[PDB]
UniProtKB/Swiss-Prot annotation:
Belongs to the replication factor A protein 1 family. This is Replication protein A 70 kDa DNA-binding subunit. DNA damage-induced 'Lys-63'-linked polyubiquitination by PRPF19 mediates ATRIP recruitment to the RPA complex at sites of DNA damage and activation of ATR. Ubiquitinated by RFWD3 at stalled replication forks in response to DNA damage: ubiquitination by RFWD3 does not lead to degradation by the proteasome and promotes removal of the RPA complex from stalled replication forks, promoting homologous recombination. It is linked to Pulmonary fibrosis, and/or bone marrow failure syndrome, telomere-related, 6: An autosomal dominant disease associated with shortened telomeres. Pulmonary fibrosis is the most common manifestation. Other manifestations include aplastic anemia due to bone marrow failure, hepatic fibrosis, and increased cancer risk, particularly myelodysplastic syndrome and acute myeloid leukemia. Phenotype, age at onset, and severity are determined by telomere length. As part of the heterotrimeric replication protein A complex (RPA/RP-A), binds and stabilizes single-stranded DNA intermediates that form during DNA replication or upon DNA stress. It prevents their reannealing and in parallel, recruits and activates different proteins and complexes involved in DNA metabolism. Thereby, it plays an essential role both in DNA replication and the cellular response to DNA damage. In the cellular response to DNA damage, the RPA complex controls DNA repair and DNA damage checkpoint activation. It comes from Homo sapiens (Human).
Length: 114
């Protein structure tokens, strides 16, 4: 009928204090840290449709196909938990815990048939 709560969700996520109201955590970008002369890291870019963050990316996403599942083609999910901790207020360090929404809204997969 009329959802896509975006003209109130994003502001309701950072303004509500993130009190279980963030049904817009989709993968819009990715940042693999496996270049030479550098440690193994996996920073991804998450957004809701206006304000992005890309600071919470340290959960079980290290899996093999969890890169394809944690962001196959822009899947929206409502994370339920996450370790939010900034390092000196500069090198922020957030981690993802779980998801709570399409949890796989690639919008392209969805196997239908039979």
């Amino acid at each position: 009928m009329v959802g896509q709560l975006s003209e109130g969700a994003i502001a309701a996520i950072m303004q509500k204090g993130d009190t279980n109201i963030k049904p817009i955590l989709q993968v819009i970008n990715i940042r693999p840290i496996t270049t030479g002369n550098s440690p193994p890291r996996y920073r991804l870019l998450m957004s809701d449709g206006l304000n992005t963050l890309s600071s919470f990316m340290l959960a079980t996403q290290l899996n093999p196909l969890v890169e394809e599942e944690q962001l196959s083609s822009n899947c929206v999910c409502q994370i339920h938990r996450f370790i939010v901790n900034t390092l000196k207020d500069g090198r922020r360090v957030v981690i993802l815990m779980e998801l709570e929404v399409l949890k796989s809204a690639e919008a392209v997969g969805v196997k239908i048939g039979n």
